[PDB]
């Protein structure tokens, strides 16, 4: 019955899946995480997510105590044990327990945890530009998908109070960065632009969509953009594992085009759907 | 006997003190914390620490589900139950569990934890000889991204800094902020002494330290010339003395920065004086546990 959580090789019922309060992952958000979809029995972009996890751990100087290969098998086993076919997966690696101070050298053993949960619109999201700026590349690099997500939560708090489904960050230079958990793209006179990934995160969904754009031969640039570009865009959409491709039909109360998902967004959304149908790593095989 | 840990009113044996993996404090470092010292049956600056806890919670829009008096009582109750007289206290309030996503409105029940342990002075046998400090390449979290004044569960900025100092020959990391101003150590405030004058950064780009506040009180009482002002690398490299402050560390002298000898190479006169006046305060003040 009850969903099981992978916890260091053990499979434990959801309601009992718990970590020592002395884990630095808990005390200090000292760890990294991923987000992964399974569609109809296949895991989409499994190895792109695992590689990013290992990069993020490396950036925080954390050794994940599983080879990448064992990590992929643990993800598939966790899904099998729970009999999932359509699912959202959340791997997490933490520093493990130490003493009460910051020093990671006192933390001999990382915890590895994998959560699995069973699993757009023709309306579109209302996006809100936030006062809080993205974490800076030289303080808490935003490319690290770490458990330090309070930057993102502050932005989400603002979007909640200010009539937004989604918060849009700028960085310190005034460049558009990304949504609180999704990359951003705009479309203007048939050309698509998205920020370079430096001040945001190297999204897997963003990467797939760049591939689709190049398959459709739509003019494309990866270039820094600003408010002026957001407020005069023909279309706007955000991307991420959970949201997939989500049209953004309003920005700060301003209607984007006619307020309905745009042509280019919709083409990308259907090419992206085929891809999630036809490619992935089969769970039951 | 095993140490007990407060968990929403329950007192749980240390080794069974555990948090659901679904708690947003664990998924997202979505909470705040404190650090408090009990010295010989008293809790030093109990109420101040509690005030800061509540301010930090308000900054993250997190409603602590105890009144301040209840929180104080919980801290004292946890210490009593452990028969502790000398302790480090780590209270923690998190957002609790909600959806898997980051939306805090979907999280109905904050989670309140209070750890109490004996825990030696951070530095801990370096107070006679002094710390070797290293300025780090990583800058402090910016005031308009992740305000460094929040004592939050998002401490990877501080940890990245500590990792650099580990690899680069230092006991402590010194942050600058994005302007090039000196900010603080990874876990403590910073003071410098030059020609008899003490300078410390305004707290905006660092953290409003309770120890730093006590030291400033001491500086004023001792009538030492004192300035709260932004400073840079030039000031660090030319200082007669350097020291850092925090609950765990107390007052620690810094005798090397980036391998350069600070004055003498041993704790300065002003630092040692303040260290002595500070020990006195830890003896005469506090809320009685028993
Ligand atoms: C996970 C994440 C993304 C999107 O990444 P995908 O790999 O497409 O799921 C974007 N921004 C932030 C801040 C994230 O945490
Ligand atoms: C807790 C803390 C300090 C020192 O605060 P006190 O109230 O003196 O203990 C300084 N800097 C940082 C980053 C901290 O987390
Ligand atoms: O140890 C830390 O995480 C930061 C500093 C602190 O909490 C303290 O001085 O008690």
Author numbering:
A (entry chain C): 2 to 120, 127 to 292
B (entry chain A): 2 to 291
Q: What does the original paper state about this entry?
A:
Branched chain TAms (BCATs) catalyse reversible transamination of branched chain amino acids. The subunit of the archaeal BCATs has a PLP type IV fold typical of other BCATs, D-amino acid TAms and (R)-selective ωTAms and consists of two α/β domains, a small domain and a large domain connected by two inter-domain loops. A dimer formation is required for the BCAT catalytic activity, since residues from both subunits in the dimer contribute to the active site.
The GEO1900 holoform (internal aldimine form; GEO1900_holo) and the unproductive complex of holoenzyme with the keto substrate AKG-(GEO1900_AKG) have been determined to 1.9 and 2.2 Å resolution, respectively, in the trigonal space group P3221. The bound ligand AKG was found only in subunit A and was clearly defined in the electron density. A contact analysis reveals that α-carboxylic as well as α-keto groups of the ligand are tightly bound in the active site via hydrogen bonds with the highly conserved residues Tyr89, Ala249, Thr248, Arg91 as well as Ala250 and Gly188 (via a conserved water molecule D238). Although most of the residues around the γ-carboxylic group of the ligand are hydrophobic, this group is also connected to the protein via several hydrogen bonds with Arg91, Tyr29′ and Leu103′ (via the water molecule–D923). Comparative analysis of the holo form of GEO1900 and its complex with AKG reveals that the binding of the acceptor substrate does not result in any significant conformational changes in the active site, except for the rotation of the side chains of Leu101′ and Leu103′, accompanied by a small main chain displacement (distance between corresponding Cα-atoms is about 0.6 Å). In addition the AKG binding residues 120–124 of the inter-domain loop shift toward the active site. This positions the side chains of residues Trp120 and Leu123 so that they shield the ligand from the solvent. The structure of the complex GEO1900_AKG demonstrates that a major difference between the subunits can be assigned to a movement of the inter-domain loop which has a sufficiently different conformation in subunit A, where the ligand was bound, when compared to the other subunits. Thus, in the A subunit this loop adopts a conformation which shields the bound substrate from the solvent. As the residue displacements were only observed for the A subunit containing bound AKG, it is suggested that this could be the result of main-chain movement due to the substrate binding.
